[PDB]
Design a protein around this ligand. Structure first.
Ligand SMILES: Nc1nc2c(ncn2[C@@H]2O[C@H](COP(=O)(O)O)[C@@H](O)[C@H]2O)c(=O)[nH]1
Ligand SMILES: Nc1nc2c(ncn2[C@@H]2O[C@H](COP(=O)(O)O)[C@@H](O)[C@H]2O)c(=O)[nH]1
Ligand SMILES: Nc1nc2c(ncn2[C@@H]2O[C@H](COP(=O)(O)O)[C@@H](O)[C@H]2O)c(=O)[nH]1
Ligand SMILES: Nc1nc2c(ncn2[C@@H]2O[C@H](COP(=O)(O)O)[C@@H](O)[C@H]2O)c(=O)[nH]1
Ligand SMILES: O=C(COP(=O)(O)O)[C@H](O)[C@H](O)COP(=O)(O)O
Ligand SMILES: [K+]
Ligand SMILES: [K+]
Lengths: 322, 322, 322, 322, 322, 322
């Protein structure tokens, strides 16, 4: 297969986390398939289909946990598969894929702004919000609240090991929003002063559980303990189809050296293992609302979102398989 | 007025956390009073007494939260003040000061051994133990349980911002004990495989609360959620006598640059505030046992420890006070 | 501009709580639109439409918290607006307004009967039921359970400040049902002898929360503690559609003189503030079932009620809006 | 009036629990409806209709608590009744009853196979599983998982009074799955070593509560306490449609001799009452998932299963009534 | 017996609650026995003893629940009994009683000021405190905090039926302390803004339970739910000796007309009973600290207070019996 | 070396549980020490000392879990060992052992009588009481309460595997107390109608945990869940002194044939392991009180009982060791 540079470059950048955040990963994946179809020198449809199947496989095999990624590929390639199988000629297939990926990207961009507007109504003037990691959906909520003239202050948790909290702090401060930066360990200590917790999602399961950045389940746990609302800002493509039929979401273990740098870890005794899980599972009981682009829901209504938007595709194989 | 150099160095080193851990700080402070008395050039008792007061003050204004520090200074200075006021000559005062310091130091070492022997009975073959920070008292228990031939494995949290987890990890590894090293945020994610939690204490209050390294409360919180025993390994001089008459324990706010290094932090805008609490408060409902040198107690019997050993002193002003 | 006297009187009476209870306020507002249309002197549809908008506005700016009120106005005005914009003549508009009002009123009466029949199946012979405020929906259930020959007894909380408990007590007594009347503070003390709790609702939100008379949350809280079922008797028009897109429900702050009478309160110093919230929010974890006219649901299925019946309308501005 | 003896044999064997488990009972009731129709000597259609109505009532008044039974009779008699009322001649009616019976029986076998496949995905290699009673749907999950190569052990609670746990223990051992057999009272003691709990269901209600073998709720309670997942394996015909309209599920009280044998019980004093409830009610807060043949749901979504599958039938009388 | 006016007048004023609050009731009881001994025209000691025995019986038989009352009588009359039984002459007995009662009154007055000083250290600048009823011990804490220059605001609950909250509000406002007055039902609604809860006690039991004004257990319940500290300001004479050997504290039921005035209750149907319990029982788990004149304790240390101060007297009959 | 057969008969009958219940076992072990001393044919004091040391070891290695047994042997052998080491001649030693045995046995009977009297005060007229196993101290409470004229019923759980519940059921019926007999699994189902729970104890630990019959912790858990008081009737010799120095209590694992009889179990596959734990561990958060013969304590005060009664003995070896 004639796979372009940008398919490979994108895949490496998802793996190394130079491209990160479940939304962005999903847009970038779709963007890459768009560039494949723009640049394909293929002659036959069968030839282009094969390229897109394989480019998709490459992109799916990057990072497992955020279902946003395979939902983006599925979006582009359910359509490309339907086109091809009703013998669409070449340019019809090339446009199906290009236009499909443009829809997904537009809809991601729109969904996020919309989550901002909905979630900001749940924020009150004077609120101290605590967040975790760097979530574009959460930030959209917080930023929108601030543009509505509510005087807010955000507590950013640094978010080890990769320090996503630095990104969140600088970003929010740059829209004018006062930020309080603390270590992940201080979450409970400062939960007393916190009015609302607003965080993102990578996968959301049928029974209402939220897989998000390591440490999320802790922040939610103590938030529930103090009766602070836990609001998870999440696009409907964050919801995980295979969990309808009993799939456990894989938890990404990343390299030990994200925790202890190589120069130091090589000096450490052999009887120490560094474990670096990238995500944990917050059960639904610690979640008050999931804010989607289609509105506020309780977390136990995640199965409704998946039935009405993804149910149909689970008797079908994956649209890049054969 | 005529204070030796070892007092000043010791205080500089407690401030800087070159010397750290509650127990060690207490011993280092006794030592410093010891050396002041050993090397004094005083001629009258009143002169030595005056040096030992001032040196006491300097040592106390180093770090507020670990009560071990002022409890050590009191063990020396209660005895030194009663001698001075009983008319003791120069050399009798000098020796009360030196010999009191030596007793505290000897009792601190024996107590930690004994805590180890007692706590280790609560560890069972195969156990997986989560800990936090670096606590000599906690390590005593794990070390002794391994020497007894129990195959334990210790989950060690890195303990940001100052990374005491690293100290714990290398230490435990050095005794042959296998370690699983994780970031603080992962503590709930791994609580499901943990059998015991074993941490230390800086201050323990009348009502049973444990003030220990920032994050301790979170670990205890999710331990409870999971029905994992939380054991606090702690010497009687970790108990806080001022709290029987309602004193709140000061939580030390340490420098922002421990969290975000100087180079970086100077690049950040005014409207980010870095907050660095070094301790939090874990409520007694989340603690199962405190393991002291005089045995196992439930946290609520903190008051009995305080009454039977420290109550007597609360009608008096402070031993180093004029 | 040309608003009848019955509209103005009805709004005065909703404000003053001469007419009160969510369900009754909704019916009273439909009625008032009915009478405005019956008695209008308009010649063109545009003139009647203009009266029905203004009368709607006046009725809506009476009391914020019970969503039954604006849901009643919408049931009339959605239908009136679609007729006007479909070119309806004067008399066709007049009749859409009158007949819509009549349908709402008829459905409000049938729904409360049906809630009664459904909820009464969950009451068992010998039961002791705590209630709160005066709710027609709750009373429907108790009344019907007694008529079925079940020997029930109802603990009635006085419901300060406005004393709706008294209304409930006299009513239940009048049907032959024995009552135990207690102050609000005694609710936990008597929860141990209570078998069921049965209250009403003013608004029910997307995520399952019940906004009902001040104190309801406390009663539900200790009911849970005690494992006593909390049943909310509530019509579909108690559900709040604005909350699916993240609106917070306004909690009505009523006059201080309801708490402390005018004579007394004028004798009190400036630095006492009397605060009179008329409602609180009970979270869904403390509610076991909502009993609607279409059946039993768990509180989390509030969103399904809102979606299938009210979602359609949230792309449009308000039916009475210009 | 002319009822074949197979109907009576079945009904007897359901009362005495020679035929047991909610699925098997249901299949056995349809099988008897099937045989009644095959072997009927009725010469008019009205006469067969009367034999089936009657057979249905004989079968329904055996064991009240498992809704599987009346849902089976419903499946057949809704269709037999629609045929009959549309003029169907004799042999059309007979076939409708036989083929409806056959449909339900094939569907039951297929549903359980599919629950096994959905549920096994939630069992991970290593897992220890506690179960209760003998449930064909719980066993499907445990069997498929072992067939998939996962090394599991199963804690089989003995399930007094009727010792269902022995059936489960021998069965699982027979597939090569190691069993740990314990008394019901040991559930909490061993819940620390348990990773998943998997049990059946006799009825599931509109608000998500699960009715299953006496003891199930105790196991789900201490499982929640310890954060072990509680998974209910339940065919959709275990869901109870009368509960949408507020019905309480009857709790069968079986013979005292099941607890204490006849020989011994007759010697006991009159003032010892032996109470044998055969089922209890587990609230939905202690259930993490229900695994049906159409996928995983949170317990709150039972109402969705009921709305879509059974809600149509509630405004009509029962299918076997005059 | 020659009983004085003031013994009778005091007893009526305790019953009618013109004299109220457990501390004050106890002082007034002791004051009354003081006035008996001042004015007794008795000639013999046996004659005076008999007067004091009977005057005590009168005073004990006023209100049952606040153990402060019998502890005050016991204080005076353990001593008077010991004096008399070592044949103290008349004036020796008269002084024993007068002086004993002066000690109790001085010690009550001192203990309260002291509880103020201890408890105020647990109050932080900016705190919103919620209280209940009118407690001199609680007010001492709050007032002292305010005199220390901490800027506080107190939420006073009105405290039905008898409105003790009016007393609390006016009193606190008169020391300059901003007060927020609300109904007992609003406690949970406003618990989010509350930093500390400070309340009194009437009886405290061996196992740590606090009997205080009806509604106390509710406020503590929701305070625990939100992690607001519950601090009970209580003198050591609030602790209940007989609970060491298994006594249940009697809960005072007061007259129905405290709830519904006579003029209205006489018009109400016969099938309504008004129940007016004056106190409820807050379990120890909802209490953080009990502040006594001897310091902060956890509530589980109430048995220590009773052992060291009251244990001795429980093999003896009551010191006014014969 | 010369051991009387009564010692061996006793030890056999303790292993086989012909002698059972923690109190009775203890009395029976002292009785055997007593008979050994009475019937000894030793002519030197050293020779009797050796027979008692040995008798003690034979008795201690019967059943590990109930500390009552070694605390009984301790009571005798501390005193026999103090006599022996103070030069005591033969007949002085013999008497010391007989009279110590006799003291412990009289004390046990008196302790249990007094627990009945303290504990009955906590039972109120009407009460329904759930219990577990057969406990002589729990039965004392229930009996005294009935003797006092209170109309109670008792829910007697059958207590598998050894059916202790039948002993309890017949015994209580024999005093005229109505019994409800249920299987262990029915505990939660019937906890709603239960007002008090009253059970025994085999050991009680330094931190307040109670070791009692397998199932006790499940009953205490659902009792807490429902806010039913859990009361433990326990003589002070049930408190476990090794636990002050960190010891874990051994959980006796008895024969699998107690669960499944020999005849049946031999037919079962090899891959079914039958596990028979005879005790479990109830944490102190689920126990409201321990009733001892010296009064009511919260479970946290067990450490106070231990400090004052047994702490002296811990720095010495066991009384029967060389
Ligand atoms: N914050 C704080 N709490 C303390 C201190 N001493 C004792 N405590 C007690 O520790 C507990 C902490 O509860 P939290 O607010 O963490 O839920 C409270 O019961 C509080 O009364 C102290 O110095 N600071
Ligand atoms: N205060 C408030 N909470 C609401 C409203 N609508 C829904 N909720 C939800 O109701 C719950 C109340 O939780 P609470 O803060 O009482 O513990 C939260 O989960 C919150 O998200 C509303 O209008 N006001
Ligand atoms: N006991 C019982 N509860 C039911 C039934 N149907 C639904 N429920 C619901 O199941 C829950 C029972 O919880 P529990 O009382 O065990 O704590 C309640 O939410 C109740 O409203 C039924 O038939 N029986
Ligand atoms: N399992 C066990 N726990 C004990 C023992 N002695 C004291 N404990 C204490 O009892 C509690 C057991 O609670 P659980 O683990 O059932 O939740 C813990 O606080 C533990 O520290 C013992 O011998 N065994
Ligand atoms: O319950 C009340 C008043 O009861 P009443 O008003 O019915 O006498 C008070 O909280 C306590 O008695 C403590 O008050 P104090 O601290 O002043 O003793
Ligand atoms: K577990
Ligand atoms: K109960």
């Amino acid at each position: 297969a004639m796979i372009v540079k940008e398919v490979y470059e994108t895949a490496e950048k998802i793996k190394s986390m130079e491209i990160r955040g479940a939304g962005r990963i999903a847009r970038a994946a779709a963007q890459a398939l768009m560039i494949q179809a723009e640049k394909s020198k293929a002659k036959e449809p069968e030839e282009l289909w094969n390229e897109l199947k394989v480019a998709s496989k490459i992109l799916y095999n990057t990072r497992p946990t955020a279902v946003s990624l395979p939902n983006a590929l599925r979006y582009v390639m359910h359509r490309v598969k339907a086109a091809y199988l009703g013998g669409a000629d070449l340019e019809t297939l090339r446009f199906t894929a290009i236009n499909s990926a443009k829809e997904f990207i537009y809809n991601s961009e729109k969904a996020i702004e919309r989550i901002g507007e909905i979630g900001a109504k749940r924020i009150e003037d004077g609120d101290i919000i605590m967040t975790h990691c760097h979530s574009k959906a959460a930030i959209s909520v917080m930023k929108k609240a601030f543009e509505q003239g509510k005087n807010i202050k955000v507590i950013v948790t640094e978010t080890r090991p990769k320090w996503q909290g630095k990104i969140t702090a600088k970003e929010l401060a740059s829209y004018g929003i006062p930020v309080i930066y603390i270590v992940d360990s201080a979450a409970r200590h400062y939960m007393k002063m916190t009015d609302k917790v607003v965080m993102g999602a990578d996968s959301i399961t049928a029974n209402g559980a939220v897989i998000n950045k390591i440490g999320t389940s802790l922040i939610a746990l103590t938030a529930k303990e103090h009766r602070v609302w836990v609001m998870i800002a999440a696009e409907t493509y964050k919801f995980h189809p295979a969990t309808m039929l009993g799939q456990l979401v894989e938890i990404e273990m990343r390299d030990p050296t994200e925790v202890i740098p190589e120069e130091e870890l090589r000096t450490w005794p052999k009887n120490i293992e560094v474990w670096n899980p990238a995500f944990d599972v917050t059960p639904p009981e610690y979640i008050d609302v999931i804010i989607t682009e289609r509105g506020i829901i309780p977390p136990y209504a995640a199965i409704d979102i998946l039935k009405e938007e993804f149910g149909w595709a689970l008797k079908y194989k994956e649209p890049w398989e054969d």
